[PDB]
Design a protein around this motif. Structure first.
Motif, PDB file in Angstrom:
ATOM      1  N   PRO A  55      33.061  54.160  33.685  1.00 19.71           N
ATOM      2  CA  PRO A  55      34.316  53.406  33.757  1.00 19.71           C
ATOM      3  C   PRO A  55      35.581  54.253  33.662  1.00 19.71           C
ATOM      4  O   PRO A  55      36.663  53.682  33.500  1.00 19.71           O
ATOM      5  CB  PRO A  55      34.197  52.466  32.548  1.00 19.71           C
ATOM      6  N   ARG A  56      35.482  55.569  33.827  1.00 13.14           N
ATOM      7  CA  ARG A  56      36.619  56.496  33.830  1.00 13.14           C
ATOM      8  C   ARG A  56      36.893  57.108  35.195  1.00 13.14           C
ATOM      9  O   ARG A  56      35.969  57.477  35.918  1.00 13.14           O
ATOM     10  CB  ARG A  56      36.356  57.646  32.847  1.00 13.14           C
ATOM     11  N   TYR A  70      26.420  56.722  27.101  1.00 15.20           N
ATOM     12  CA  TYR A  70      27.139  55.915  26.117  1.00 15.20           C
ATOM     13  C   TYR A  70      26.127  55.358  25.123  1.00 15.20           C
ATOM     14  O   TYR A  70      25.177  54.680  25.529  1.00 15.20           O
ATOM     15  CB  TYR A  70      27.878  54.765  26.794  1.00 15.20           C
ATOM     16  N   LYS A 110      25.932  45.513  26.599  1.00 13.64           N
ATOM     17  CA  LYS A 110      26.137  46.942  26.444  1.00 13.64           C
ATOM     18  C   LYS A 110      27.573  47.342  26.656  1.00 13.64           C
ATOM     19  O   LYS A 110      28.032  48.282  25.992  1.00 13.64           O
ATOM     20  CB  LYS A 110      25.198  47.649  27.413  1.00 13.64           C
ATOM     21  N   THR A 111      28.319  46.674  27.568  1.00 14.47           N
ATOM     22  CA  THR A 111      29.719  47.050  27.733  1.00 14.47           C
ATOM     23  C   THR A 111      30.500  46.923  26.430  1.00 14.47           C
ATOM     24  O   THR A 111      31.413  47.708  26.158  1.00 14.47           O
ATOM     25  CB  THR A 111      30.438  46.235  28.818  1.00 14.47           C
ATOM     26  N   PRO A 145      36.025  42.480  37.794  1.00 11.62           N
ATOM     27  CA  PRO A 145      35.343  42.616  36.491  1.00 11.62           C
ATOM     28  C   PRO A 145      34.773  41.307  36.008  1.00 11.62           C
ATOM     29  O   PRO A 145      33.692  41.290  35.427  1.00 11.62           O
ATOM     30  CB  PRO A 145      36.434  43.169  35.546  1.00 11.62           C
ATOM     31  N   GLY A 160      23.581  44.307  30.709  1.00 14.62           N
ATOM     32  CA  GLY A 160      24.680  45.233  30.837  1.00 14.62           C
ATOM     33  C   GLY A 160      25.938  44.680  30.228  1.00 14.62           C
ATOM     34  O   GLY A 160      26.715  45.406  29.622  1.00 14.62           O
ATOM     35  N   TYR A 201      22.630  54.605  29.284  1.00 10.95           N
ATOM     36  CA  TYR A 201      23.516  54.495  30.436  1.00 10.95           C
ATOM     37  C   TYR A 201      24.674  53.595  30.070  1.00 10.95           C
ATOM     38  O   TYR A 201      24.645  52.882  29.061  1.00 10.95           O
ATOM     39  CB  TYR A 201      22.777  53.958  31.671  1.00 10.95           C
ATOM     40  N   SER A 202      25.712  53.628  30.892  1.00 11.29           N
ATOM     41  CA  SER A 202      26.862  52.802  30.578  1.00 11.29           C
ATOM     42  C   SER A 202      26.517  51.341  30.822  1.00 11.29           C
ATOM     43  O   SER A 202      25.814  50.981  31.781  1.00 11.29           O
ATOM     44  CB  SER A 202      28.083  53.160  31.424  1.00 11.29           C
ATOM     45  N   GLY A 203      27.017  50.496  29.943  1.00 13.04           N
ATOM     46  CA  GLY A 203      26.887  49.073  30.144  1.00 13.04           C
ATOM     47  C   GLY A 203      27.565  48.632  31.411  1.00 13.04           C
ATOM     48  O   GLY A 203      27.076  47.758  32.114  1.00 13.04           O
ATOM     49  N   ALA A 204      28.685  49.269  31.746  1.00 14.88           N
ATOM     50  CA  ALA A 204      29.385  48.915  32.969  1.00 14.88           C
ATOM     51  C   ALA A 204      28.499  49.093  34.186  1.00 14.88           C
ATOM     52  O   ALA A 204      28.453  48.219  35.053  1.00 14.88           O
ATOM     53  CB  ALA A 204      30.668  49.722  33.075  1.00 14.88           C
ATOM     54  N   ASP A 230      29.270  49.621  23.838  1.00 12.93           N
ATOM     55  CA  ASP A 230      29.822  50.916  24.171  1.00 12.93           C
ATOM     56  C   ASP A 230      31.206  51.118  23.596  1.00 12.93           C
ATOM     57  O   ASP A 230      31.622  52.252  23.401  1.00 12.93           O
ATOM     58  CB  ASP A 230      29.889  51.063  25.686  1.00 12.93           C
ATOM     59  N   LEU A 266      34.722  46.082  31.301  1.00  8.46           N
ATOM     60  CA  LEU A 266      34.194  46.869  32.416  1.00  8.46           C
ATOM     61  C   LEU A 266      34.816  48.258  32.474  1.00  8.46           C
ATOM     62  O   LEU A 266      34.147  49.230  32.845  1.00  8.46           O
ATOM     63  CB  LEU A 266      34.404  46.130  33.734  1.00  8.46           C
ATOM     64  N   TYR A 267      36.096  48.386  32.137  1.00  8.94           N
ATOM     65  CA  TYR A 267      36.775  49.676  32.238  1.00  8.94           C
ATOM     66  C   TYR A 267      36.942  50.352  30.881  1.00  8.94           C
ATOM     67  O   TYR A 267      37.722  51.306  30.749  1.00  8.94           O
ATOM     68  CB  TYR A 267      38.109  49.490  32.948  1.00  8.94           C
ATOM     69  N   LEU A 316      32.892  51.169  39.959  1.00 11.59           N
ATOM     70  CA  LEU A 316      33.057  49.854  39.369  1.00 11.59           C
ATOM     71  C   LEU A 316      34.418  49.251  39.642  1.00 11.59           C
ATOM     72  O   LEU A 316      34.577  48.040  39.447  1.00 11.59           O
ATOM     73  CB  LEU A 316      32.769  49.955  37.853  1.00 11.59           C
ATOM     74  N   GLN A 317      35.383  50.038  40.126  1.00  6.44           N
ATOM     75  CA  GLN A 317      36.657  49.466  40.542  1.00  6.44           C
ATOM     76  C   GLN A 317      36.531  48.569  41.773  1.00  6.44           C
ATOM     77  O   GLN A 317      37.464  47.820  42.072  1.00  6.44           O
ATOM     78  CB  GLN A 317      37.664  50.561  40.903  1.00  6.44           C
ATOM     79  N   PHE A 357      34.563  46.080  42.363  1.00  8.71           N
ATOM     80  CA  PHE A 357      34.094  44.734  42.069  1.00  8.71           C
ATOM     81  C   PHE A 357      35.102  44.067  41.142  1.00  8.71           C
ATOM     82  O   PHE A 357      35.826  44.740  40.419  1.00  8.71           O
ATOM     83  CB  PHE A 357      32.710  44.739  41.382  1.00  8.71           C
ATOM     84  N   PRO A 387      37.475  40.569  30.638  1.00 10.71           N
ATOM     85  CA  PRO A 387      36.424  41.322  31.353  1.00 10.71           C
ATOM     86  C   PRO A 387      36.904  42.677  31.805  1.00 10.71           C
ATOM     87  O   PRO A 387      36.143  43.639  31.761  1.00 10.71           O
ATOM     88  CB  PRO A 387      36.038  40.407  32.537  1.00 10.71           C
TER      89      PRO A 387
END
Ligand SMILES: Cc1cc2nc3c(=O)[nH]c(=O)nc-3n(C[C@H](O)[C@H](O)[C@H](O)COP(=O)(O)O)c2cc1C
Ligand SMILES: Cc1cc2nc3c(=O)[nH]c(=O)nc-3n(C[C@H](O)[C@H](O)[C@H](O)COP(=O)(O)O)c2cc1C
Ligand SMILES: Cc1cc2nc3c(=O)[nH]c(=O)nc-3n(C[C@H](O)[C@H](O)[C@H](O)COP(=O)(O)O)c2cc1C
Ligand SMILES: Cc1cc2nc3c(=O)[nH]c(=O)nc-3n(C[C@H](O)[C@H](O)[C@H](O)COP(=O)(O)O)c2cc1C
Lengths: 173, 173
Positions: free
Chosen positions: B10-11, B77, A86-87, B44, A83, B81-84, A90, A48-49, B39-40, B42, A44
């Motif tokens: 995620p960057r 992405y 999508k992660t 993952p 989502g 939008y980002s999946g993250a 991506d 996520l990252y 997102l950091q 939570f 994960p």
């Protein structure tokens, strides 16, 4: 002939994944090499990252490169695809679906949002350069009778799946 | 007055997050209580597997409940939008944005896909029942001069941000 199936639901088992389960069975009857993936098969933190050095991503992208088609399934979450799915999309290379046939599948609470997820998925699959995006199968929850045991669908949904899979098979040749 | 800012990239650091950084600074000049999340913050595995008992999700949903507005930023992405970011939105209660003003922000490679991410975000924010979704600021990468140090934008993008933030401030009252 090789096909990847990809389950986008973060639930196990999953209603949308039961459509994929039915597809894989139809396909194995036809002498298709099927590789099935779900989000449990990646770390994960890599998803996520957006860690492009993910080991599992390397394997997945290698299997997808050799594949002729992709069947991807998602629940409807917040009027769109998950989502979680999508992660992973991506993280696929540009042109990852070039030359390939894509069959999208989804299950959702309401018909209105089944139209929404169809409209939302298409630009993403187009951004990955899919050669053709089939109409797909977008079904409300009441059409899946059982997704915990042997998948069981209403006659209407089973017919729609069989049609879509025959269309997918032909599109592959 | 309380505002949540949410970074969807995620960057770290992130170009889209530099717009949020500029917003938080404008807002703290106005005596707004700002809570910033990325997102950091939570686990993952909680996000990828949609674990509604996530501890951080509980805190985030509690802070959002007390908030009057949300500023959310995303990269583009795969034309969306980002999946993250979506993994977290998927975990928000129904009606999570009821009564609240939402300012969307995005950065992307191409203008065409900046239109696409605008169109993709709206139905998701509407599904969360946002009271108003502002026009927002969708900028191509060339408009951000520096996102690693003190955020630096072209004059055009800085003006668009200042307008959007003034619109956001007024909409809150
Ligand atoms: C977090 C969550 C969000 C959902 N959001 C929607 C929605 O916005 N519109 C809708 O029609 N159904 C929504 N549903 C219902 C699911 O789309 C539907 O139950 C789906 O079949 C679940 O598929 P799965 O079992 O493969 O995860 C949501 C379900 C969950 C768990
Ligand atoms: C239109 C519709 C929208 C829904 N939206 C959500 C949602 O946003 N968040 C959520 O947790 N459940 C939502 N649900 C409910 C889930 O389907 C319900 O909690 C179900 O029991 C979840 O089971 P699951 O996690 O196995 O998919 C929605 C249901 C429907 C019919
Ligand atoms: C995995 C990835 C996918 C991207 N896909 C698109 C795309 O489909 N269309 C586009 O215009 N830009 C695309 N871009 C460019 C980013 O949208 C842009 O560089 C953005 O400013 C990055 O924002 P961030 O630094 O906040 O992550 C992509 C970038 C990455 C890393
Ligand atoms: C239109 C456009 C689309 C892009 N799509 C992708 C993509 O799909 N996957 C990817 O890894 N990089 C993509 N990029 C490139 C990233 O912006 C580039 O790799 C950048 O160096 C990534 O830096 P970052 O991870 O810090 O955002 C795209 C760039 C542009 C302009």
């Amino acid at each position: 002939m090789r096909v990847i199936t990809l389950a986008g639901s973060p639930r196990f088992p999953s209603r949308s994944s039961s459509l994929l389960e039915y597809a894989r069975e139809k396909l194995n009857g036809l002498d298709v090499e099927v590789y099935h993936w779900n989000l449990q098969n990646f770390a994960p933190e890599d998803l996520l990252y957006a860690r492009f050095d993910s080991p599992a991503l390397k394997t997945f992208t290698e299997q997808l490169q050799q594949a002729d088609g992709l069947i991807v399934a998602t629940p409807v979450y917040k009027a769109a695809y998950s989502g979680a799915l999508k992660t992973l999309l991506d993280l696929l290379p540009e042109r990852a679906l070039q030359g390939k046939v894509v069959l999208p599948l989804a299950t959702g609470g309401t018909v209105a949002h089944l139209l929404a997820v169809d409209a939302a998925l298409k630009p993403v699959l187009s951004a990955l350069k899919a050669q053709e995006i089939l109409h797909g199968v977008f079904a409300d929850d009441s059409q899946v009778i059982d997704y915990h045991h042997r998948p069981q669908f209403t006659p209407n949904l089973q017919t729609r799946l069989d049609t879509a899979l025959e269309t997918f098979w032909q599109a592959l040749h």
